[PDB]
Design a protein around this ligand. Sequence first.
Ligand code: SF4
Length: 214
Amino acid sequence: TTRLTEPQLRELAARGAAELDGATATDMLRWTDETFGDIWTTCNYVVASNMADAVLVDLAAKVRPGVPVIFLDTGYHFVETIGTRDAIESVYDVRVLNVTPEHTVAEQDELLGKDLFARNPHECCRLRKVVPLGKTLRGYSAWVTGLRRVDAPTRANAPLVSFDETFKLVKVNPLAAWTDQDVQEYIADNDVLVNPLVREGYPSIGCAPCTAKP
Ligand code: SF4
């Protein structure tokens, strides 16, 4: 494998969380790149995005050109989300990776009942998001997400750096301390791309069947 050892990863996550207490998003990404950078697509840390905007993508490309960015194409996405994905891949200096489940929508419908998302959403999410994400992250020692502590009351204590137990690696959230005004001013000052559905009155953007219509 190409993963770092579990105790090594836990100690690195602890040292990073202690050392980056109160750092800006760029400082966290700089530390991540300095730690897991070598030994441009030949990288040891990856960035994850839901294609709702290109804030974290812009930052990661500014600190590391050609950085890999994973997108979980569950086959239930909006056409606008796939269009935003393509736009970010064409514009930004980023290596995009289309993480797809091994079974298509039609295949899963025929093998486990049509529209499995409506009959059991947890298993659909596990099959099309969690399992492919884990199979892809096997190989990377750390991964970066655009999680903000304001996303939910349960996310209020989201750490800057920690050890993700679900995939057993290092998880760093640069946008954790960011507020809505923060991301708004950043998008304004940097002219970064935004999913059209966000402009069309959508709080969050996920799979088409499991997104609350306004
Ligand atoms: S959000 Fe809905 S459609 Fe998308 S993977 Fe989860 S259960 Fe399936």
